[PDB]
Design a protein around this nucleic acid. Structure first.
Ligand SMILES: Nc1nc2c(ncn2[C@H]2C[C@H](O)[C@@H](COP(=O)(O)NP(=O)(O)OP(=O)(O)O)O2)c(=O)[nH]1
Ligand SMILES: [Mg+2]
Ligand SMILES: [Mg+2]
Ligand code: NA
Length: 429
DNA sequence: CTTATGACGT
DNA sequence: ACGTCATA
């Protein structure tokens, strides 16, 4: 009805880099450019574990979580770059730094929420209103949207760019005619700005990215993945019913795990759109008040989670798995690795303080023990009063030492399969 | 045979 | 404070 909210109050973008770590490595080594390429961690065991894959390499079926030795079977010519290894562990510093390059460019256009090392949300609502005033009812040319897809169009040509343009033309013709709503116009100007943002990013870093533009974070994120790489996608409120009608529930953010599986199992459905049939109370009874409320609105393309003004990460941490045989079975060994972890952390904390005028005040220590399915066996915290690796490693050991079942002080049992140090609770410096 | 992040429940 | 989930 007239009083019914449609969740069209905001313009939100999600900008996500294509094959991020690969591009960073490609920029540094031109030999890797425009080639089937992947980035791995370590190399001894099975060639190393792949965590990023160029789109050339993806065409051969290489994916994330694949051992490099196995990827080579699919793609014999696969080029590999290795994550920096420091103090016996993976060091992601280059990418965190590359991340900052991108975040800083994005932050010139609008307030951003860093969502991961390679992506951020953008609230473009104010920016759109400002650009709209500047444009005096002056129509929007397709030249202003050279990489934009309008999801759901065309409707009513053989090549992809041909279909992109026709859908875009159909969309633009419906704004200029007055067939579309003002939210639609707002989304379009938002997409214009994102084109500019993405141009600035590539010019100034050499990195390409994709983007989604919509009315909320979830639709923005979903939209971004629709036309990767090097393209942006506008998902309108109107496109939602068709989009969601065959959209598997697991594809929506936060529903890719257990909750999503329970939604599918309990309700006996498969697609996001099928959720509209249930009342809010019904959804609440099965999945709780909060989730139920979120699911009722989300299946209608409505989501209110704000873009938090947070450009920097809330936490600074590092970890290392010691699986199977490599599990840490002595006290001396556990302490040595706590020191390696603490040294990297201290290095990152020190730079963080100089860069961002803040200090962590709490240190979180997490371990995993052999034979435990759970990712984390035990979590403990202590005060973080000094940026000193020796103290931090020593304190971390103090808070976890009790775990040691072994009767001998010299040996550690059950052996440790993971160590994790996280600096948290920042305050102004 | 990974290394991170953020959010939420109790 | 601690554990769990979700992301990738
Ligand atoms: N250490 C570690 N780094 C990872 C892992 N998974 C991903 N990364 C790193 C490597 C990734 O480059 C980066 C960004 O994550 P995505 O955006 O999910 N993948 P990409 O940007 O590669 O491709 P596209 O977005 O176009 O699909 O984070 C992991 O399990 N562990
Ligand atoms: Mg990416
Ligand atoms: Mg990403
Ligand atoms: Na090359």
């Amino acid at each position: 009805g007239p009083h019914m909210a449609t969740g069209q109050d905001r313009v939100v973008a999600l900008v996500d880099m294509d094959c991020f770590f690969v591009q960073v490595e490609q920029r540094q080594n031109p030999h890797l450019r425009n080639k089937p390429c992947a980035v791995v961690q370590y190399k001894s065991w099975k060639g190393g574990g792949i965590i990023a894959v160029s789109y050339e390499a993806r065409a051969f079926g290489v994916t994330r979580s694949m051992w490099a030795d196995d990827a080579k079977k699919l793609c014999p010519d696969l080029l590999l770059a290795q994550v920096r290894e420091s103090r016996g562990k993976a060091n992601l510093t280059k990418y965190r730094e590359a991340s900052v390059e991108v975040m800083e460019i994005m932050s010139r256009f609008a307030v951003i929420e860093r969502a991961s090392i390679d992506e951020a949300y953008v609230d473009l609502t104010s920016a759109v209103q400002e650009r709209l005033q500047k444009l005096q009812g002056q129509p929007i040319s397709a030249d202003l949207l050279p990489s934009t897809y309008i999801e759901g169009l065309p409707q009513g040509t053989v090549q992809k760019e041909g279909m992109r343009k026709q859908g875009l033309f159909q969309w633009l013709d419906s704004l200029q005619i007055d067939n579309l709503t003002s939210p639609d116009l707002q989304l379009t100007v938002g997409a214009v700005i994102v084109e500019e943002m993405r141009a600035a990013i590539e010019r100034e870093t050499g990195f390409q990215c994709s983007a989604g533009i919509s009315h909320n974070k979830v639709l923005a994120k979903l939209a971004c993945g629709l036309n990767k790489p090097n393209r942006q996608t506008l998902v309108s409120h109107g496109s939602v019913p068709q989009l969601f009608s065959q959209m598997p529930i697991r594809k929506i953010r936060s529903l890719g795990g257990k909750l999503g599986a329970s939604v599918i199992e309990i309700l006996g459905i498969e697609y996001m759109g099928e959720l509209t049939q249930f009342t809010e109370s019904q959804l609440q009874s099965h999945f709780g008040e909060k989730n139920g409320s979120w699911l009722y609105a989300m299946c209608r393309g409505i989501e209110h989670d704000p873009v938090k003004p947070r450009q920097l990460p809330k936490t600074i941490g590092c970890s290392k798995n010691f699986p199977g045989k490599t599990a840490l079975a002595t006290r001396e060994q556990v302490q040595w690795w706590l020191l390696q972890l603490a040294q990297e952390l201290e290095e990152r904390l020190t730079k963080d303080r100089n860069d961002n005028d803040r200090v962590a005040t709490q240190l979180v220590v997490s371990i995993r023990v052999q034979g435990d399915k759970r990712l984390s066996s035990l979590r403990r915290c202590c005060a973080l009063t000094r940026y000193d690796a020796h103290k931090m490693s020593h304190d971390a050991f103090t808070v976890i030492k009790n775990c040691n079942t072994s009767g001998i002080q010299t040996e550690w049992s059950p052996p440790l399969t993971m160590l994790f140090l996280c600096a948290t609770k920042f305050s102004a410096s």
